[PDB]
Amino acid sequence: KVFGRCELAAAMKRHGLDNYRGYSLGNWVCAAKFESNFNTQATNRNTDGSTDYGILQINSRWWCNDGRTPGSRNLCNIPCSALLSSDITASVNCAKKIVSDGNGMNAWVAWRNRCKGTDVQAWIRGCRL
């Protein structure tokens, strides 16, 4: 599914991301924009052979199992394919674990380079939330 911007904001809010670990909703929307262009089916292979999955590009190195990332962990205890569903529940639950883990949203490289310090509120402007 390709979410609309306000559509995604609403789903994220409903699933308790808004201000989770102090990150406002626009942070999460902005991260999703630049990670996946709001596409739940997005996949990208990393140089190390790990793969990033879903709306938030959660990496199989640590967070989900894909059967093909040697040495990796599955700290969200999910198949990586669950991160590609039209329903964002598994993605959000796993994101919550990731952002709690010490580096906050810096774990998302596109967040750090494209969202951090910017006017992230723009991402939820005009949404009925």
Residues 75 and 97 sit within 8 Å (Cβ to Cβ) = yes
Residues 100 and 92 sit within 8 Å (Cβ to Cβ) = no
How many residues sit close enough to Cl ion to count as binding (CB under 5 A)? 8
Residues 42 and 56 sit within 8 Å (Cβ to Cβ) = no
Question: 3-class SS at 14?
Answer: helix
* Per-residue interface string for the shown chain with Pt ion, residues 1-20, x marking contact by CB under 5 A: --------------x-----
Residue 119 known to bind ligand: no
Distances (CA, A) of 128 to 7, 42, 45: 9, 26, 35
Nearest-approach distance from CB 82 to Pt ion, in angstroms: 14
Question: Helices 25-36 & 5-14, crossing angle to 10 degrees?
Answer: 130
What residue 74 binds from Na ion, Cl ion, Pt ion, none (CB within 5 to 8 A, per partner kind)? Na ion
Asked whether position 107 contacts Cl ion by CB under 5 A, the answer is no
Nearest-approach distance from CB 63 to Na ion, in angstroms: 7
Task: Name which position in 6, 24, 97, 112 contacts Cl ion (CB under 5 A).
Answer: 24
Residues with catalytic roles: 35, 52
Annotated binding site for substrate: 101
Which residues bind to Pt ion, rule: CB under 5 A? Answer: 15
